[PDB]
Amino acid sequence: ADYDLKFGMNAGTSSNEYKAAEMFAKEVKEKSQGKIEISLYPSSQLGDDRAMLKQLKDGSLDFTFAESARFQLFYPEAAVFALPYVISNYNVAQKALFDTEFGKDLIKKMDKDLGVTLLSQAYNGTRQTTSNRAINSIADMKGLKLEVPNAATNLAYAKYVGASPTPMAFSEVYLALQTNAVDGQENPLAAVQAQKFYEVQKFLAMTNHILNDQLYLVSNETYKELPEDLQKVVKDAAENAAKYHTKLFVDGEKDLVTFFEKQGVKITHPDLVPFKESMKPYYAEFVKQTGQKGESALKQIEAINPHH
Ligand SMILES: CC(=O)N[C@H]1[C@H]([C@H](O)[C@H](O)CO)O[C@](O)(C(N)=O)C[C@@H]1O
């Protein structure tokens, strides 16, 4: 095609993310009259999200996904998006990104410093905790070898509840669980399904600890070369796909607990008050490290009412 473009992702071919990316690719090919074709590169084929963000910056990859929280790699105060229990729900995540001074500045910096244009934001689920033994209370987390992505906020979740975090690549997790080299992991339910972690985890605990969004991102080096009518095709398609993406996740969260029960998984509902209490020293440490920019971002987010 005139524009043979590439969209990389860590999620696999059975995931919501892949499904929504297929919708995006289809719409762009149709509405561009075949001028643009977008090929998908799932399962970390091109590296992980940190690696794919570098590739968008350089111009060697055209599209990828990232959470708003992942920009904590560059701007420490952006960890606010994944401090456990701080962001209440997706309504708050949307307003945090688009309707605060903090979020609006972050979007501008992504463009200026990191070479990426934010096309749209979707919901990517709320993280829960699976394990090879029951989590009936925070006490059960003690010494649990909890696999997490290599991201400071997930490492801190594990640390502050008393678990022993082991950071790993997403592709390696299934085998780590199966072999009991680790005792659990902490993705949203849709990823537990997509990765078939339920085949290798007898327990699921509703820890509700981190709220994931998902940003549809384009390399500035690619976006700048598209005539404005094709830029509009891509932007409109990204917005349409994001609504569909969010819907997949919202619908799954209704149904997936019952799906896992029928696969033989036991579900627990530990008291979250001690989980939330355990994070108070982490928020303090966040404010100590990130200074006034962090305190301000927290304030702006804590002001957002979570009811639509
Ligand atoms: C956009 C993306 O790649 N998301 C991935 C996510 C993020 O890397 C971390 O939450 C850090 O932001 O990590 C996973 O949940 C994980 N490795 O278990 C897999 C997700 O597909």
Author numbering: 1 to 308
Question: Which sentences from the paper describe this structure?
Answer:
Tripartite ATP-independent periplasmic (TRAP) transporters are secondary transporters that have evolved an obligate dependence on a substrate-binding protein (SBP) to confer unidirectional transport. Using in vitro, in vivo, and structural methods applied to SiaP, we demonstrate that the coordination of the acidic ligand moiety of sialic acid by the conserved arginine (Arg-147) is essential for the function of the transporter as a high affinity scavenging system.
To investigate whether this water network adds plasticity, i.e. ligand promiscuity, we engineered an R147E mutant to maintain the hydrophobic part of the arginine side chain and yet have the capacity to coordinate water 1 and water 3 observed in the R147A structure. In addition, by using the charge-swap from Arg to Glu, we can also assess the ability of the water molecules to dissipate the apparent charge clash. To investigate further the ability of the waters to relax the selectivity of SiaP for its ligands, the R147E mutant was crystallized in the presence of the non-cognate ligand sialylamide, which differs from Neu5Ac by a change of the carboxylate to an amide. The R147E-sialylamide co-crystal structure again reveals a closed conformation with an r.m.s.d. of 0.2 Å from the wild-type SiaP in complex with Neu5Ac. The amide and the opposing carboxylate group of Glu in the charge-swap mutant are linked by the two interstitial waters 1 and 3 in equivalent positions to those seen within the R147A mutant. The presence of the NH2 group results in the slight rearrangement of the water network around this ligand (waters 5–7 in Fig. 5A) as the NH2 group donates rather than accepts hydrogen bonds. In vivo data confirm the in silico predictions as growth of bacteria containing SiaP with the R147E mutation is more impeded than the R147K mutation but less than the R147A mutation. These data suggest that the two waters are able to accommodate two carboxylate groups pointing directly toward each other, while retaining sufficient function to enable bacterial growth. Our crystal structure confirmed that the mutant protein is able to use water-mediated contacts to bind sialylamide, an atypical ligand for SiaP. The finding that the wild-type protein was able to selectively bind this minor contaminating component, while R147E protein exposed to the same stock crystallized with the bound sialylamide, confirms the important role of the Arg-147 residue in the selectivity of SiaP for its cognate ligand.
